[PDB]
C-alpha cells in the first residue's frame, strides 16, 4: 500500500497551531481545529494525526475539543498528547480513536507501557521524539528504548526529529532508515517535511518499513495542498503535481 499521509491537527489553547522545534511558546495560530480537521477530510485524507499539545506539555488539556473532532470525522484518527495512564488511555479509546500514541509514558512507565501494548495491540503506537540519539519528553537513549519496546511487542513507532519539526528543512531520512532497520514494526515519519519532493522521498521508504508520514507545517504554510501531497504519496510525479 502507498505511503499513508496523516495531516496533523495540533491543538493548543483551543486553536490549531504549529510549533517550531517542538518548543512550547513557539506557536503559530491557524484558527479552528475542527475546521482544519474538516478540511483534511474533504481533501481525501484517510487519517488525521490529532495532538493535544497542552496535555503533551503537562500543562492543561483540550480533551473535549479533541473528542468532538474524533467523533465528527468519519475517518481514522491517531490521537496523541497526555496519554499516560489508564484513565487517559480509556478516555482516548472511548472517544473513538483508531490509534493512540504514547510518548512520555513509554519512557517514564515502562511497565505500564508494556501492559498497554499487550492489551491493545494495533491501537497503540509509541512516539519517539529524538534529538540526536536522545529522547525528549514534552528522556533516555533512543536505541536502548527501541530495543525494550520491541521486546514488549510495540506494533508501531512515530519517529520525530525534534530539531527538524516545523522547520521546513526536510525530514531526517537517515534517522528514519536507522530506526526502521532496527524494528519489524512500521514507522511513521514526522518532522521537517517541506516539499512534494520530500513526500516522494518518503514514499520510496515504504519498502523499508516507513509506511506513513505526518505532515504539519508544510500544509498550514500553504507549500502544497493536501490533495497535491496525497497525489505524490500515491505515485503522481512531483513535476506534474507542482502548481
Residue numbers in the entry: 0 to 137, 143 to 247
Paper text:
The product of the priA gene, which is a hisA homolog, catalyzes two analogous isomerizations of structurally similar substrates: (i) the conversion of N-(5'-phosphoribosyl)-anthranilate (PRA) into 1-(O-carboxyphenylamino)-1'-deoxyribulose-5'-phosphate (CdRP) (TrpF or PRA isomerase activity); and (ii) the conversion of N-[(5-phosphoribosyl) formimino]-5-aminoimidazole-4-carboxamide ribonucleotide (ProFAR) into N-[(5-phosphoribulosyl)formimino]-5-aminoimidazole-4-carboxamide ribonucleotide (PRFAR) (HisA or ProFAR isomerase activity). Moreover, evolution of PriA in response to genome dynamics has lead to the appearance of the SubHisA and PriB subfamilies, which have been shown to have different substrate specificities. After the loss of constrictions imposed by the retention of biosynthetic pathways, we found that evolutionary patterns correlate with the sub-functionalization, yet not necessarily specialization, of PriA into two new subfamilies, which we named SubHisA2 and SubTrpF.
First, enzymes from Org15, Org21, and Org22 (H1) showed dual-substrate specificity but also poor catalytic efficiencies, namely, kcat/KMProFAR from 0.01 to 0.1 μM−1s−1 and kcat/KMPRA around 0.01 μM−1s−1. In the case of the H1 enzymes, the poor turnovers are compensated for by relatively high substrate affinities (KM), mainly for ProFAR. Since the loop contributing Trp139 and Arg137 is mostly disordered, and Arg137 itself does not adopt substrate binding-relevant position in the structure from A. urogenitalis, only the equivalent elements from the M. tuberculosis homolog are shown. Trp139 is important for the correct positioning of the catalytic residues present in loop 5, and for substrate binding through stacking interactions. Indeed, the indole group of Trp139 in PriAs can form a hydrogen bond with Asp128, stabilizing the knot-like conformation observed during ProFAR binding. Arg83 interacts with the second phosphate group of ProFAR, allowing its correct position in the substrate-binding pocket of PriA. An extra factor potentially hampering sequence and structural analysis is the higher-than-normal mutation rates of these protein sub-families, which translates into lack of sequence conservation and disordered regions in X-ray crystal structures.
